[PDB]
Amino acid sequence: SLKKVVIIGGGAAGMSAASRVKRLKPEWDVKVFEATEWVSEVFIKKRGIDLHLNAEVIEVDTGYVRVRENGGEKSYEWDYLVFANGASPQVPAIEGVNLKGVFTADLPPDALAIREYMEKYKVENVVIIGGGYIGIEMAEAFAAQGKNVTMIVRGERVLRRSFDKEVTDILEEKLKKHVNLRLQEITMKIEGEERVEKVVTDAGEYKAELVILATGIKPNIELAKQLGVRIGETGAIWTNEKMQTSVENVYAAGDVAETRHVITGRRVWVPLAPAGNKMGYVAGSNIAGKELHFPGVLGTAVTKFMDVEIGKTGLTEMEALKEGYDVRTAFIKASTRPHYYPGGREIWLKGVVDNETNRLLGVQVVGSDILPRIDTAAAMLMAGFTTKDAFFTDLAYAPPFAPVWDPLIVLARVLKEG
Amino acid sequence: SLKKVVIIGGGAAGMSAASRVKRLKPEWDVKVFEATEWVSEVFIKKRGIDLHLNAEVIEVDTGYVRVRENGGEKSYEWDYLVFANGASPQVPAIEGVNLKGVFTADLPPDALAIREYMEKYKVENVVIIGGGYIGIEMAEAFAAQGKNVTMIVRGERVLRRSFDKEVTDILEEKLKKHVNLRLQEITMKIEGEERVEKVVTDAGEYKAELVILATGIKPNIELAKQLGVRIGETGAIWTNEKMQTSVENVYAAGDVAETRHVITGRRVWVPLAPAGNKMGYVAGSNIAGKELHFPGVLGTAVTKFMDVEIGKTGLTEMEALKEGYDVRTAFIKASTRPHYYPGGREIWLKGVVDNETNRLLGVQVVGSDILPRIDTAAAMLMAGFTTKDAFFTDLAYAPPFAPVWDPLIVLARVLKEG
């Protein structure tokens, strides 16, 4: 039999879904509609997937969808539909945010655009509004180009809601030495003639010939609300372990979807590509008739500013307390190598533990050589490891790799004894 | 009450034990007896531990120990004993093992000594005997010295018993380009006038000013055998979860102690530093009246030759088949970064799986940026994760740290669909 499967996405989740259902059902007609020029060369045609780029979906209803591609407007039939249209920038409500000066760090075109622009009309000073992940990277990006950079965050510190203050402090310390960090400020508007000229906030004004808004992202749910799909308390599309929505045969994965936290169990929205990919993977499995449950996410994340790396996995102390846990914590400094081997950098680990179960609730790591600590910790968290379980986990050691007591085991010892 | 703890060791396992019994029971008399001049700097004297360097133990019995220190003998009483006397190099029974230019990489003076003989007597050609970790790490050394190196291994390939062939081949590939690798050759003679001149093997002869005997390590169970302590089927001291031996109130930890494999349950001998420190830690805790259990080890190992790192955790395909397991494996190649991002190096992963439980039995990794994978896999293995559990672990992602699908998740995926 045939079965028409239609995917409104094209990004990480859309294509993972597409590929899984195609490989499981070669005889089925799987299509992907990307409202854009990007994916992940349409090699996919050979893969057996009918990709349509710059094909925008403008109406959807049960069994069908209407897309406008190449001026034309055609409508397609579907048995199984998958919402995989990710998230989009959320523009702030400040005066004039559309002048030739402003740019948002999103789709690769902007990367071509924004960059090209600068590498044209000479741009010296550049201001970034946002103390989030995106903000920080763009900051690093520009400083590296020698351009003077200035960050504006309304909160008391950057990454204000993603990490606790003790991890952030190490980052801010380094950050302040390459970018002009302006906290507690609220932008109030941004004047100029044909191009952005100056940015003004309730504390001062700043020279600016390029501006980046890293003020936020929102799930692209409009098309789904049209199908009457239930959207979660988080603002993203409600979903179950199979990536199923409240409407029959309608799945949703990636940045549009709201998933569940593996630790707290409540619903969350963690728009990160690794999970998105798997979300699309199980959506496609279930569509093709093979049961597969997605456990949920840990909220794992990582980024960096120049050489100081920062990462988390699991609950933060803010989150853990917010959730009503009785927690004990620990914050330790350690080294990336034995204190003799050359190249040993510094590494800081924050640990949050459930005092009642001695269960590790979350770990935050900043400094150097973070990836090993957070990935191991994520596995531990995924398994419900206690402070004791982590201490006795047989991790690797060699002078060029790490110290006899891995920074993760140290934190564990310190939590256990507390 | 007064309890007299005596530790025959001084090494990692030894000090952990002392440091633990001492913290938990400040009032007890804890004495460590090192035959040598090194440990882990009597800051340990302030911790309350009565450390005795150059205090070689020569006899032991139910009530006392007879150590030979400072010309004369002395006997100390003990209510609790701990064998933490580690392991010694095992020399081949061949001609002139003691020519002035021959060494074994063990006790700290060896480093100073070897580097002295090399940094004094002009040394050009250095010969290494054995294809172990010690052999390979030593090659990387003299090779980086500009010195010419020739390695002799009697087996068909290096790390013949520790890693599967497809993993070691990558290593040998880099190895054959900086060292003269001589496989399947049994060393027979090492000759020279007063100092080593050459080495002769059943396949030829090589010239050497300095030779490294990295052919094996062996548990120092002699003083324990004297006390009737049951020694394991592996050759090292038998032990239980609390690091107790067959003799009452006698514990053992470190390279002398035989532990158990977490995945297999069989008794194994895995002389590594992290495990040792923990064995010693639980030995103490238990002597002090605090029940603690060491779960055993995974066999986690890591090492590297120049820029090609090689590691593992859990069973090897050889071991798995050896244990009667129904296995399916997978070997994949991947990038350490997104394949667009600059800096991406190659990384290889071999995974073993129980075809009946779908539980991961082991992971061997080779190439670049190894640590994050084998450490994460260690935790997964430590928890009894299936191919599917591993697939869904929330690992971190950002272009500077890793690709969207971590190579560990890629392996899981390939194993799962396997």
From CA A40, how far away is CA A13, in angstroms rounded?
A: 8
With CA atoms as reference, the chain A residue closest to B295 would be: A392
A397 annotated ligand-binding residue: yes
Residue B107 Cα distances to A127, B11, B87, angstroms: 58, 10, 10
**Nearest C-alpha neighbor of B242 from the set B189, B283, B273, B203:** B283
From CA B148, how far away is CA B239, in angstroms rounded?
A: 44
> How far does the CA of residue B214 sit from the closest CA of chain A (Å)?
17
* Expt. technique: X-ray
Could you tell me if A288 lies within 8 Å of chain B, comparing CB atoms? no
From CA B1, how far away is CA B23, in angstroms rounded?
A: 16
Contact A370 B401 (CB under 8 A): yes
A365 burial type by CB count under 10 A (0-12 exposed, 13-18 middle, 19+ buried)? buried
Say if CB B143 and CB B178 are below 8 A apart: yes
Mark which residues 156-195 of B lie under 8 Å from A by CB: none
With CA atoms as reference, the chain B residue closest to A374 would be: B396
A249 annotated ligand-binding residue: no
Token pair for B34: 């090192």
Say if CB A253 and CB A276 are below 8 A apart: yes
Token pair for A377: 């910790």
Residue B136 Cα distances to A103, B26, B51, B108, B143, angstroms: 53, 43, 34, 18, 10
**Chain B contact probe: residue of A278, A282, A370, A371 with most B CBs at under 10 A:** A371
Contact B298 A394 (CB under 8 A): yes
Indicate left, alpha or beta for A314 from its phi (over 0: left) and psi (-120 to 50: alpha). Answer: left
Residues 6 or more apart from B282 whose CB is under 8 A from it? B242, B243, B253, B292, B293, B294
From CA A372, how far away is CA A366, in angstroms rounded?
A: 12
CA angle A366, A175, A408 (to 5 degrees): 5
Indicate left, alpha or beta for A18 from its phi (over 0: left) and psi (-120 to 50: alpha). Answer: alpha
Which of B272, B297, B393 is nearest residue A379 as measured by Cβ atoms?
B393
Could you tell me if A295 lies within 8 Å of chain B, comparing CB atoms? yes
Q: Which long-range contacts (CB under 8 A, 24 or more apart) does B242-249 make?
A: B242/B282, B242/B283, B242/B286, B242/B291, B242/B292, B242/B293, B242/B294, B243/B279, B243/B280, B243/B282, B243/B283, B243/B286, B243/B294, B244/B286, B245/B83, B249/B79, B249/B80, B249/B81, B249/B287
Domains contained in chain B, CATH given? 1-86+217-297 (3.50.50.60), 87-216+300-418 (3.50.50.60)
Say if CB B412 and CB B395 are below 8 A apart: no
Token pair for B98: 């003691």
Query: Can you say which residues of B are annotated as belonging to the binding site for FAD?
Result: 12-13, 34-35, 57, 255, 273, 397
CA angle A318, A90, A307 (to 5 degrees): 60
Alpha helices in A69-213 (DSSP H): 108-118, 133-143, 165-175
User: A69: which strand partners?
Assistant: A55, A72
B41 burial type by CB count under 10 A (0-12 exposed, 13-18 middle, 19+ buried)? exposed
Alpha-carbon dihedral A339, A341, A346, A349, rounded to 10 degrees: -70
In the sheet that B50-52 helps form, which strands lie side by side, from edge to edge? B50-52, B29-33, B4-8, B80-83, B250-252
Alpha-carbon dihedral A302, A303, A309, A314, rounded to 10 degrees: -20
**Chain B contact probe: residue of A163, A388, A394, A404 with most B CBs at under 10 A:** A394
Which of B299, B377, B404 is nearest residue A273 as measured by Cβ atoms?
B404
Say if CB B51 and CB B42 are below 8 A apart: yes
Which of B301, B382, B394 is nearest residue A393 as measured by Cβ atoms?
B382
Mark which residues 50-69 of B lie under 8 Å from A by CB: none
E strands present in A78-139: 80-83, 87-89, 102-104, 126-129
* Number of CB pairs, chain A paired with chain B, less than 8 A apart: 146
From CA A418, how far away is CA A416, in angstroms rounded?
A: 5
From CA A145, how far away is CA A312, in angstroms rounded?
A: 28
Say if CB A292 and CB A242 are below 8 A apart: yes
Could you tell me if B311 lies within 8 Å of chain A, comparing CB atoms? yes
From CA A411, how far away is CA A349, in angstroms rounded?
A: 7
Residues 6 or more apart from A247 whose CB is under 8 A from it? A62, A227, A228, A229, A230
Say if CB A185 and CB A162 are below 8 A apart: no
Token pair for B72: 């004369």
User: A206: which strand partners?
Assistant: A199
E strands present in B135-276: 148-153, 180-183, 187-191, 198-201, 204-207, 210-213, 217-219, 250-252, 259-260, 267-268
Token pair for B211: 């030779």
> How far does the CA of residue A321 sit from the closest CA of chain B (Å)?
22
**Nearest C-alpha neighbor of B257 from the set B5, B3, B16, B4:** B16
From CA A43, how far away is CA B117, in angstroms rounded?
A: 62
Chain A partners of B393 at a C-beta cutoff of 8 Å? Answer: 378-379, 382
Token pair for A401: 């790799």
Chain A partners of B134 at a C-beta cutoff of 8 Å? Answer: none
3-state secondary structure of B324: coil
**Nearest C-alpha neighbor of A126 from the set A214, A207, A213, A201:** A207
Indicate left, alpha or beta for B89 from its phi (over 0: left) and psi (-120 to 50: alpha). Answer: beta
Contact B371 A402 (CB under 8 A): yes
Chain A partners of B409 at a C-beta cutoff of 8 Å? Answer: 274
From CA B80, how far away is CA B17, in angstroms rounded?
A: 11
Residue B115 Cα distances to A400, B88, B384, angstroms: 19, 20, 45
Give the rounded distance of the alpha carbon of A36 from its chain centre. 20
Token pair for A370: 């973070």
Strands B250-252 and B80-83, bridge-based pairing: parallel
By residue count, chain A amounts to 418
**Chain A contact probe: residue of B341, B394, B408 with most A CBs at under 10 A:** B394
